[model samples]
Target: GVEIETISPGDGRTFPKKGQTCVVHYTGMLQNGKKFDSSRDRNKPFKFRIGKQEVIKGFEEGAAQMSLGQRAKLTCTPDVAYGATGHPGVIPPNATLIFDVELLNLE
Candidate 1:
C-alpha cells in the first residue's frame, strides 16, 4: 500500500518532529463541488502534523502525501473519510468529500 505522510494528531501544542507541524489554509467541498468549509474565507490557517489522526482518515492520508508548501486537491471516498455514518449534521451518508489543501509551513 502507498504510504500517506501529512496528517497529524491535534495535541494542542508540541509536535513529534521539528518540521512536522504544518500550517495550512483549506477549502472543502462535496463531490458535487458545493462548498462546505473554507479557511480562505475565514482568514485563518489550520495546523496539523504528519501521520497524526487529527482529521479524518482520508484527510490525514492525503496530507501525509504532500510536501511542505505544496497545494493540491484531494477527493476522498466516504469509506476512507467520514465513513457510512458520516457527521450527522455536516455530512450525509455515503457522500464523497473534496479538499483543497495548502501545505503552508512545517514546525
Candidate 2:
C-alpha cells in the first residue's frame, strides 16, 4: 500500500472532491534517482478530473485528498501504483516509484 505524506501543506479553502478538476505539477522518479517524467519540463501543469483514472492509483488517491498549493511526496509500491506488470520502458516491473506532487489548483 502507498500513502502520500504532506511535505508542505496548503490551506486552500477548496479541495478537490470526487468529480472536481485538479491541476498539478509533479516529477516522477525511480528509487535509484533516475527521473522518468517531469511536468515542469513540459512547462504545463497536468490536468485531470479527480474521479477519473487518468493518473496512477497512488497519485489519484493522493490528489483527491490534497489541497491547493499543497506539496506532497509519496513512495508508492506497485500494488498501489502500477501492478506487477508495470509500464514497460517507463516503469520497471513491481518497482517502487517516488514522486513529488505540487497542487496548483483544485475546483
Candidate 3:
C-alpha cells in the first residue's frame, strides 16, 4: 500500500481523473534515504497519464490523490513499487521507495 503525507495543500478541491495527464516534479529515494532520481534535477517535470500504467504503481496511485500544486511525500511498499524483482540497476529486491512529489499541473 502507498502511505501518503501531505506537505502542502494544493489549489482547488478537484483531483485529476483517470486518463488525464499529470505533470509533476519529484525526487525518488530509497528507504535508506539514498537519492535515486529527480525531475527537478533535470529541470523538467515528469508527465504521465493517470491509470495508464506508464510509471510505477506507487507513483500513479500517489498522483491520483493529489490536486494541482500539491506537495506530498509518498512511502511505497514493494507491492506497490517494483515488487520482488525490482528495477535491475536502480533498485534492489523488495525495496521500499520514497517520493517527494508535487502535482504541478493536470491536463
Candidate 4:
C-alpha cells in the first residue's frame, strides 16, 4: 500500500471517480532524495484516467485519495512502485519511491 501525507488540502468535497481523467504535477524521487522524474520540470501536467493502470499502483491509489488542488507526499514501497525490475536506468531494484504530487484537475 502507498502512504499518503497531506501537504495541502483541497476543497469542493469531491474525489475523482474511476474512469474520470486526472491531471497532476509531480516530482518523483528515491528515498534518498535523488530525483528520477518530474512533470514540473517539463512544464506539463501529466494526465491519466483513474483505475486505468496508466501509472504505477501507488500513483493510482494516491490520486484517488485527493480532491482537486490537493498537494501530498506519497511514499510508495517497492511492491506498489516499479518492483524488482524497476525502470531500467532510472529506478533501481526494490527501491522505495517518493513523490510530491499535486492534483491539478479532474475531467
Tens-digit per-residue lDDT, 5-62, candidate 3 = 8876678476989878778899988887589999978987877777768888888888
Q: Tell me each candidate's TM-score.
A: 0.75, 0.88, 0.91, 0.92
TM-score of candidate 1 versus the correct structure, residues matched by position: 0.75
What digit string (tens of lDDT, one per residue) describes model 4 on residues 16-104? 89789878899988897589899988987877788768898888888888888778899998977778678888887889999999888
32, model 4: CA deviation in Å? 1.1
Give the top-scoring candidate (TM-score).
Answer: 4
Comparison by lDDT, 3 against 4, better one: 4
Model 1: residues >4 Å from true position, as ranges? Answer: 1-19
The full ranking of all candidates by TM-score, starting with the best, is 4, 3, 2, 1
C-alpha-based local distance difference test score of model 4: 0.84
Backbone clash tally (model 2): 0
> On lDDT, who's better, 1 or 3?
3
lDDT of 4 at 89: 82
Q: Per-residue lDDT for 11-42 in model 2, tens only?
A: 85567887777788988988876999999999
**Stretches of candidate 2 exceeding 4 Å from the true structure:** none
- Model 4 residue 58 CA deviation (Å) reads 0.9
Clashing pairs in 2: none
Q: Model 1 over residues 1-107: C-alpha lDDT tens digits?
A: 22333354333233234337778788888877588888899787877666556778877766656665556678787887676898888888888888887676656
- Model 4 clash pairs are none
